[PDB]
From a paper:
Patellamides are members of the cyanobactin family of ribosomally synthesized and post-translationally modified cyclic peptide natural products, many of which, including some patellamides, are biologically active. Patellamides originate from a longer precursor peptide, which is modified by a series of post-translational modifying (PTM) enzymes to yield the final cyclic product. The two domains of unknown function (DUFs) are homologous to each other and are found at the C-termini of the multi-domain proteins PatA and PatG. The DUF domain is conserved in all patellamide-like cyanobactin biosynthetic pathways characterized to date, suggesting it may play a functional role.
Author numbering:
A (entry chain A), B (entry chain A): 920 to 1067, 1070 to 1184
Write the structure that this text describes.
C-alpha cells in the first residue's frame, strides 16, 4: 500500500508504442478518431487491455489507469463508457464532461507514445467512479425549488458548479488534495442543496477546508465550509453549508448530513 | 522598491477600529450597508481616506490598498466606482464582478477590525485598473462572429472566460503569478479573438505558460499558450493562441499581437 489517489479529469487512451498503434491501424480507418475506437472496443472488449488508459486534467496526463483484480473487465467497461460519453453531443443524456476516479497508488510508471513517463494507479472496481455533465446536475437542482427566473437560476447554478470544479481540482494525492477533489464530487451530488441559496439571490463567496474534529481517531476527516452571500442587497445574512469528508478510504465517504445555517 | 503586485478580486472597505466605525455610524443608518457607504462617499469624497480599502480574492483579504502620490484622489474615485459597480444589478451596464489592480509592494501592514494583519500595497494612479462583467465581455465577443446558436455560443464563451479566471487567479506577487493574473486580464480584453474558436465548436483544453525568449534582456516575459479542441468530432485540428506578456513593469504590457495557428 503506497497511499490513495482521488482524481478528476478526462479519460483517454494511448498506444504506448508504434507496434500497438499499428495493431489498431489495421482494425479501423483511423485509431486516433476516438469515435472509431469506442466502436471497435465496444465490439471487441478484450482489445481494451492492449491500450494505456490515461486520466488527464486540462491537458496534463497525470495518471495511467491500471485495472487489476477480479473486476478488471468491469473497470474496462466503465473506462469505455466514460470515453464514449465524452464524445457525445453536449445535449445528450449520456454526455460526460466531469469525471471522478478513486485509485490505489503504486510505484510503477509507464512510458506514453510521446515519451512522457506517468505514474500508474490501480483502479480495482467501478465503485466511486462517476461521470457527470453540468446541465444534468443543474436540471436536478432546479427540480427542488420554486420559480418562474429559470434562465437566471440555471446560469447561476451552472456558474457555481463550474467555479467549484476549477477552484479545487488538483492532482489528488495528499489528504488535503483528495479532500478538495472529493468536495467537487460531493458538491455535484448535492447540487440541489445549494439551489435555494442561489435562487434566493446569493452566490458562493468562500470555500474553506479544515481538518475535522468530528471523526474517530485514525480517520482522515476534513470539514468543508461553503458560504454564500448577496453582493447586491444591503445587510443580508450569509448562508453557510458544511459537510465532513473522510478520505482515509480509497472510496472517500461523507460523514453525516450536510449542515446549513445563517450568519 | 520591494517589487510589484498584480492582483485580481473584490474591492471592499474596513473600519480598522471602533472609533472609525462610530464616525460612520453617525453618518448613515447602517455603514455596513455598502449601498449606503457608496452614497455617503459619493457625496463626501474626502471621507474615503478614513477607511481601509481592501482587495479580496474569494473571501481572503489579500491586500490593503493605499493610494499615494499626487493621484491619490483619482485612485479613491476608482475605488468607489468599483465598490459601486459590484453592488449593481447583474443586468446593469455598470455591473462589476471582475477586478484588476496593479500595485507596488511595501513593507507596511495594517490591522483590520477583525484583528487580521494584511500587507499594504501602493496604488499610484488609475492606469491598468479594470472592472468587468462577464456578460458584457461575451456581448463584445459575439459582435465579431457570424451565427444564428447564439444561446449556445453565449454559454460557451461565458464558461471559457469563467474557467480562465478560476484556473489562474492567484496572490499576484511572484513573476509567474503576476503573469497568470495578467493572462486573465488579457483574455478578457481579447475575448473576441477566441470567439471564432468557440463558435467553430471548440473549447479550451490547455493553458501553458512559459518564460519567453522573445523579449529584450532585463524584461520579465512569459509566453502563454491557450489550445482549443473539439472533443466531439473525430480528428480535428487544435487551435493555438499565443501571446507574450511582460510583467517587469508595475503596469504589465502585452508584447506584439496575439498569434494563432492550427496543430
Ligand atoms: Zn480548471
Ligand atoms: Zn475562483
Amino acid at each position: 500500500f503506497s497511499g490513495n489517489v482521488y482524481a478528476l479529469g478526462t479519460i483517454g487512451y494511448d498506444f504506448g508504442d508504434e507496434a500497438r498503434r499499428d495493431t489498431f491501424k489495421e482494425r479501423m480507418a483511423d485509431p486516433y478518431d476516438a469515435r472509431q475506437m469506442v466502436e471497435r472496443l465496444d465490439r471487441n472488449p478484450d482489445e481494451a487491455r492492449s491500450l494505456i488508459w490515461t486520466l488527464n486534467l486540462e491537458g496534463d496526463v497525470i495518471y495511467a489507469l491500471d485495472p487489476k483484480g477480479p473486476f478488471a473487465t468491469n473497470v474496462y467497461e466503465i473506462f469505455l463508457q466514460m470515453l464514449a460519453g465524452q464524445l457525445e453531443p453536449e445535449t445528450s443524456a449520456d454526455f460526460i464532461e466531469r469525471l471522478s476516479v478513486p485509485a490505489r497508488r503504486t510505484t510503477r510508471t509507464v512510458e506514453l507514445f510521446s515519451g512522457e513517463v506517468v505514474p500508474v494507479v490501480n483502479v480495482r472496481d467501478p465503485r466511486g467512479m462517476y461521470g457527470w455533465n453540468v446541465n444534468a446536475l443543474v436540471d436536478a437542482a432546479l427540480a427542488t425549488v420554486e420559480y418562474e427566473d429559470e434562465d437566471s437560476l440555471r446560469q447561476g447554478l451552472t456558474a457555481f458548479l463550474n467555479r467549484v470544479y476549477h477552484d479545487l481540482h488538483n492532482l489528488g494525492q495528499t489528504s488535503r488534495d483528495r479532500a478538495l477533489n472529493f468536495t467537487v464530487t460531493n458538491t455535484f451530488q448535492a447540487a440541489s442543496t445549494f439551489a435555494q441559496a442561489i435562487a434566493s439571490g446569493r452566490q458562493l463567496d468562500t470555500i474553506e477546508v479544515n481538518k475535522s474534529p468530528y471523526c474517530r481517531l485514525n480517520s482522515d476527516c476534513w470539514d468543508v465550509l461553503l458560504t454564500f452571500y448577496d453582493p447586491e442587497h444591503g445587510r443580508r445574512s450569509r448562508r453557510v453549508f458544511r459537510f465532513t469528508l473522510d478520505v482515509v478510504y480509497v472510496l472517500p465517504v461523507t460523514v453525516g448530513s450536510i449542515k446549513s445555517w445563517s450568519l
